[PDB]
Amino acid sequence: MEAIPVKQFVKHIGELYSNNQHGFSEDFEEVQRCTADMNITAEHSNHPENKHKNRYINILAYDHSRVKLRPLPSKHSDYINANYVDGYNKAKAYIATQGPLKSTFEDFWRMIWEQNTGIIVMITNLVEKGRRKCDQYWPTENSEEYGNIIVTLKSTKIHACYTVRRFSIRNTKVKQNERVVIQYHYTQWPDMGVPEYALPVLTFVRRSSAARMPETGPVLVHCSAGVGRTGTYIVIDSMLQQIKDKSTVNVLGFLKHIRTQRNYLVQTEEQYIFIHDALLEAILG
Numbered sequence: 001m002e003a004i005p006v007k008q009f010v011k012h013i014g015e016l017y018s019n020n021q022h023g024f025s026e027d028f029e030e031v032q033r034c035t036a037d038m039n040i041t042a043e044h045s046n047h048p049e050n051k052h053k054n055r056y057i058n059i060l061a062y063d064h065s066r067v068k069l070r071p072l073p074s075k076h077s078d079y080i081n082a083n084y085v086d087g088y089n090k091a092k093a094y095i096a097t098q099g100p101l102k103s104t105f106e107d108f109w110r111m112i113w114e115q116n117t118g119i120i121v122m123i124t125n126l127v128e129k130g131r132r133k134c135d136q137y138w139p140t141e142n143s144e145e146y147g148n149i150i151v152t153l154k155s156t157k158i159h160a161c162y163t164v165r166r167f168s169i170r171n172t173k174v175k176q177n178e179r180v181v182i183q184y185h186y187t188q189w190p191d192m193g194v195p196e197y198a199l200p201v202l203t204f205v206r207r208s209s210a211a212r213m214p215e216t217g218p219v220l221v222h223c224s225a226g227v228g229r230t231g232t233y234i235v236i237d238s239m240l241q242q243i244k245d246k247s248t249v250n251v252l253g254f255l256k257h258i259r260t261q262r263n264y265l266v267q268t269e270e271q272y273i274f275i276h277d278a279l280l281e282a283i284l285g
């Protein structure tokens with residue numbers, strides 16, 4: 001189970017799809033079992049003092065890979081539900097994290113400053129099908145203050161399927177010192193069912209990924225829980241890098257791997273199939 005030449009990957013997709021996606025089903029179940037003989041601790045996520053900091057009681061941040069906040073003059077001011085995740089070759093190329101709650105906007109922006117993140121990839125809407133997915137952690141307009149980071153919205157471009165917001169943030173307890181942070185926000189979400197046509201996404205991935213500057217902190221990627229759509233993004237992004245580099249693909253292997261770094265990355269078979277549709281589009285296009 002290693003890399004597949006890009007020229008036979010497309011053929012492979014045919015096989016995975018046939019007989020009602022039986023092959024896709026076997027792959028993803030392998031992925032879900034891939035953790036089986038594996039205990040990964042998330043004690044910090046389960047600590048009573050950190051509970052109100054998790055959006056979902058079941059969606060945790062593995063200890064070994066968790067992003068640590070600089071502790072504050074309490075014992076658990078270091079905790080945020082987030083994990084470093086690997087990209088193509090490069091270790092810790094992403095921070096995959098949940099959609100921020102009101103009570104964690106400070107942690108969220110502190111992490112971004114502390115990690116020197118320059119790009120945010122947002123893969124949810126605040127509200128979807130009437131349900132709360134994510135609290136708005138940025139200024140509707142002008143500036144807003146979170147802890148010692150105050151964020152200023154500088155410009156916005158709204159496309160068919162996503163929006164790009166350029167922020168300038170300054171730390172007040174520095175010097176102040178300022179950074180640009182660019183948010184890529186995918187906004188095109190189904191009233192009924194789930195996303196299906198992968199081409200607009202491929203474009204989103206291509207443009208947000210190309211926005212990464214040398215040599216900066218990891219790209220922050222979040223949806224709501226920070227595992228499903230977030231994992232889909234990371235795999236599509238990484239595999240496109242691999243294709244450019246070596247003209248080979250390894251979805252099943254890379255995914256089993258990043259699954260050790262954050263629980264449930266790529267959460268459903270449908271998302272798993274979607275990754276393949278995205279990459280098929282890139283290859284044929």
Ligand SMILES: Nc1cccc(S(=O)(=O)NC(=O)c2sccc2SCc2ccc(Cl)c(Cl)c2)c1
Nearest residue numbers: 123186194195201204228232233267270271274
């Ligand atoms: N159970 C469950 C958990 C989380 C999400 C869902 S869900 O909404 O029903 N299901 C989904 O979100 C699905 S299912 C197939 C594709 C997608 S998302 C495709 C997509 C869109 C924009 C970007 Cl930028 C990327 Cl990289 C990928 C279901």
